Amino acid sequence: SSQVEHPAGGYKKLFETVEELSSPLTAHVTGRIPLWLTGSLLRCGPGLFEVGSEPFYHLFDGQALLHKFDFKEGHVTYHRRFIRTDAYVRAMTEKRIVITEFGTCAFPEVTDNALVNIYPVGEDYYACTETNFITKVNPETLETIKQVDLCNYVSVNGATAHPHIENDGTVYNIGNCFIAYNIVKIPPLQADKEDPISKSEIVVQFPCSDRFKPSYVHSFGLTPNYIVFVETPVKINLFKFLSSWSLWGANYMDCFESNETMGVWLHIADKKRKKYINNKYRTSPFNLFHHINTYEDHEFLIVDLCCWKGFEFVYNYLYLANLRENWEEVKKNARKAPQPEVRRYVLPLNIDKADTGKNLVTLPNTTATAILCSDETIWLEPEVLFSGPRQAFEFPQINYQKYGGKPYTYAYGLGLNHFVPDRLCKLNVKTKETWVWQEPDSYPSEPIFVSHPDALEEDDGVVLSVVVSPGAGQKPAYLLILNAKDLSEVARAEVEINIPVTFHGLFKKS
Amino acid sequence: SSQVEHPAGGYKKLFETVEELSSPLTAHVTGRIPLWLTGSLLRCGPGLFEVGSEPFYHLFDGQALLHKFDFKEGHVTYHRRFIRTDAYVRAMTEKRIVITEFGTCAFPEVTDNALVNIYPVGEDYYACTETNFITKVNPETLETIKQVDLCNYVSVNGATAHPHIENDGTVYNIGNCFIAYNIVKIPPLQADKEDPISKSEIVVQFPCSDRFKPSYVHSFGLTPNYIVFVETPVKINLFKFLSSWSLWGANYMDCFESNETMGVWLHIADKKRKKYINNKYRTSPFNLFHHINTYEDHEFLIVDLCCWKGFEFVYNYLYLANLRENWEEVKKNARKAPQPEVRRYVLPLNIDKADTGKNLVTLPNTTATAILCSDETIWLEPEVLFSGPRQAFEFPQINYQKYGGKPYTYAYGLGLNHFVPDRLCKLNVKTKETWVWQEPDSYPSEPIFVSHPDALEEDDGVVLSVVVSPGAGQKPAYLLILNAKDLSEVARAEVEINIPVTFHGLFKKS
């Protein structure tokens, strides 16, 4: 949890327009950047929160800005460029908001504003949002290369900003299909050097709980053998979604609604045999954005999640007008929101009918349960790993390359305090111990883990976070490096310009 | 949680018949019995687990034994006597099992085997089980005085072993009525000196979810202004209950069943105005035996519970044949049981329809939620205070006389390890910090709190527990005194005879 209030309102700098750079800046280092740290921290966020006098309204509307911190021989540079999406290019051409964004209707066509994340496919990098459009970008120069429409390759209406990436480069993702949720597989780059996106295919399909209302999906779980999909009560109303938006004046937010009675349905598919498994896992209602990690343990799936307790859409609390209020009002506004909580669910793969009415979770190290009912629903209860009052452990990251899909011990996260990011956190998922890093008037980003290249342990490395520090008598922002063992500071690299909120990203080793 | 295994099987001594004493024994003190500790620890449990060659089968069937430890000027005595109930007297007369017990059908009439608890009414003390019969006992000599049939005074079929006792001596209890659940109030002793039981009355009534199947009820919550009743999915099948038992060969356990779909319904009544409040609080399924404490906070009720996650009746795992198995088998048998977990529920008293779809728990220091649905059900999620794998914090006690019904910080409990009692625990309900006391091959009882006479703080006092220590090179049992601050040992008082399991009790100051 946080130990800090924010009466000075500095968090408003997260949502203020910035200018791009024409070339990199030096970042001024205090302490010692590790000499084994070589590569680029690439991150995406909104950078332009209005077009002239026309405002963007929602957190997820501002124009995509691609950021890069470079690390070589103890030195750091910072660079950023707006992504030349259709949304951005047409906005600059016509000097107004042209494309409708998540929560901003454009007055007189799907957004490709790739403000959320960036990931590798073959030898390429793509910036993304959650639509059918992804944007190929140059990871060295930050130039925009092209727009890719996933509909030219596979049958989905969109795909999440959180694909899984296996160690050979295979990319898995999930998307709505308008009715199913489809898993897309993009193969690794082959000898022919053809674009792996042209070899995309749907490998498995998950059913939908309601023919006319698919659930919003933000991420999904993956292990060597299984795919996990969590179907929440946050629904997309297709009657509103598919009607003419410029007639009714609609955006994406306007089409969301909450199903009050379904709770959460959890789904598993066999990855290698490409089959849906018809086990009816059921639990109480929550919003889910981020899976933390998923793994197999004696034929139970361990499903660690960042939950929000409630069925109201958490995104209702993320309009910029609310995030820009003063601190007492920010706290007030969050009082009735769903409460964040880290939860471990445990899904049995072997269901014996003879155990009807009993708890199937016979593993020795968990309090999670799964009750087989007579109608064959399997009712689940979680093991809570972390819970604090409006204190969210969010934007989770792990040592992904060596523990993604596997038994693991450690997660890193951004701590939110009534939605305001104000600390960095580490959680031991076995013991429930936590570690916190926090300074007054300092607004960090998602922490990304970088292993020492020769590490044998799980947390032998560092985390990197971009911190906005608007207090006078500090530079406006800095790159923070913490030791992953205990979250103690190793170095920081200060820049002379503001940096807005960033969502997700990656470290690219060179 | 426990840090101890039990391969030697010493816990079997908890379920072995003992003899009563004709007068008190000296208990041999090591350490220092506090000099302010003056009075009697009175506890009940089973003491006779067979009649000749006819065995009792369930944990709750053995014949009531009343135990007393007396404390004066640093010295301790121990005494025990079988309660001369009908069940026990008729068993000794006819040399067989005569009355059907909870899980033992007598072959060729309600049990009054008062093996569970003891409590004060006026100037009297009554041993009890959960039926219509309570047994008046002499707290100094342990002689049995009288059988009292509550049906002579009030309309209930039974009453729990956990009445609440206000500081003036007013007694509240709850019981099934064959359909409602009735709250009984027994007034304090008046100037006329008449038996307060003859002034008993029903003051409020809770409705039942199912006309033909009332829930099992073990305890309930009380505050200065409210009464809280938790209606669980463990049901009593009245078609089986009210049929002829000697025809079918039935006991009480045979009439229980689990309702799979209802979950848990929570209920509130206004204590002083004597009215049921029609708020439909709803959550997922659990067993509940013991409320920890309940209190009011800005017109939310804070409801702290010892839960078991699941709908299967936890009492299925408590047959003596299973509790007497070897340790690996004990662990195996508990794998599919509901998982224990301490949970805080928060119940809003002011429900605004304008907040439909939102979380009503606007208190600043909890993660518990209550979602108002369109059908006006209020769906609850808990804040988990403690959770360990088959590690139950059970038999909760607090500083009851000063903090019962009131804002509080500390609870004490008996720790169960796959149902075997092997440690004592303290929980800070605000911070979730825990303290444990535990020795190898030592089986404690419920801890009971006794305040220091000059206490300033909530935990200024001791806890008393009866510990069974069957390892050779130790005496068979002892009275343990722990400092309530940190659960460090202050003294023990050893006795030269075995003591079986005890359930509940009280400290009587003199």
Ligand SMILES: OCC[C@@H](O)c1cccc(OCC2CCCCC2)c1
């Ligand atoms: O994928 C982007 C993250 C978004 O899903 C999400 C999920 C859960 C909480 C949340 O909070 C938004 C805050 C982030 C930091 C800036 C202030 C608002 C945002």
Ligand SMILES: OCC[C@@H](O)c1cccc(OCC2CCCCC2)c1
């Ligand atoms: O009111 C009497 C206690 C009974 O309700 C109960 C409630 C919850 C767990 C439990 O476990 C039984 C073990 C207690 C210690 C002896 C061994 C069995 C027993």
Ligand SMILES: OCC[C@H](O)c1cccc(OCC2CCCCC2)c1
């Ligand atoms: O996670 C934050 C919102 C996301 O960036 C976003 C921004 C703009 C449009 C979106 O649309 C989601 C739909 C796309 C089509 C298929 C159904 C989901 C989603």
Ligand SMILES: OCC[C@H](O)c1cccc(OCC2CCCCC2)c1
């Ligand atoms: O907590 C252990 C079981 C309890 O002592 C017990 C022992 C014997 C008979 C019982 O009967 C419960 C019913 C009484 C009549 C009304 C419905 C409950 C209950």
Ligand SMILES: [Fe+2]
């Ligand atoms: Fe995300």
Ligand SMILES: [Fe+2]
């Ligand atoms: Fe009890």
Ligand code: NA
């Ligand atoms: Na600090």
Ligand code: NA
């Ligand atoms: Na110990």
